[PDB]
Ligand SMILES: Nc1nc(Cl)nc2c1ncn2Cc1cccc(OCC(F)F)c1
Ligand SMILES: [Mg+2]
């Protein structure tokens with residue numbers, strides 16, 4: 001409650017898509033997650049649902065944020081707080097509100113908070129080629145995604161101070177734990193097109209078919225019943241976390257550029273280590289000595305962002321994100337000048 005003024009002023013317009021996440025980063029001194037988590041979890045009423053104290057939530061955010069590595073240019077707690085902001089924005093949209101249940105909202109907001117915890121600033125493919133402890137521990141399969149969810153549950157339930165789940169009932173926790181794990185694991189790159197195509201095929205195309213019939217009261221209930229199944233709610237949750245995770249190209253230009261520099265610097269660090277250690281170079285284009293950041297951002301947006309956000313926008317209606325996406329794409333194209 002008693003927040004200092006600059007951090008309070010940094011968190012004023014957090015329902016809005018335009019949000020100065022880097023000012024929140026500077027004002028909190030690399031602690032944006034704990035302050036933005038407290039406000040978001042309070043506004044959604046999360047501890048009322050989980051029956052946790054404000055003091056149990058505080059310790060939980062603390063130990064989760066602590067295990068985010070500040071030395072990572074991108075994969076630090078500021079990224080998680082940003083993904084929490086985009087997650088809350090999507091939940092607040094009319095289509096998600098009338099489709100998802102309160103337990104899903106709780107699963108999404110916790111999942112955004114924990115989804116990259118203890119990221120080492122290296123890709124899964126780096127850890128497998130290096131034979132890292134977590135690649136041997138997780139058998140080269142979704143190495144970091146399994147670690148994030150597992151460590152998050154180790155930190156939460158391992159201590160009575162941090163366990164925000166301790167006052168829940170048996171069945172509710174099993175359902176909520178399975179929801180979090182599924183959203184955290186869905187962020188793995190190799191499953192990108194699989195999760196996008198399942199969303200298009202099972203949601204967008206069926207929903208577009210039924211919208212051709214009309215705006216009938218009996219028709220809306222068929223649409224409501226179809227979307228609200230457990231299978232389709234899972235597919236929406238995977239899409240929502242996946243979009244929030246890589247929402248930075250749909251941000252205001254000033255933030256879009258900062259996120260590009262951070263993730264690029266992070267991939268250049270891995271490339272310097274791979275050449276030094278003799279490891280196979282998994283991202284050859286991302287070398288600080290040869291990489292055109294604007295052109296790599298264009299390739300990134302064409303490969304992962306454009307179709308995914310096209311489908312998500314067709315479902316949720318996200319005009320501001322697509323307008324920013326267009327403006328940012330044109331900015332990158334305009335910097336060539338050659
Ligand atoms: N602006 C960005 N540019 C680049 Cl080069 N990578 C980014 C960016 N924002 C997040 N990432 C991380 C990333 C990298 C590759 C794929 C990816 O996919 C999202 C899902 F498929 F895993 C996310
Ligand atoms: Mg991740």
Ligand SMILES: [Zn+2]
Pocket residue numbers: 079083115116245
């Ligand atoms: Zn992430």
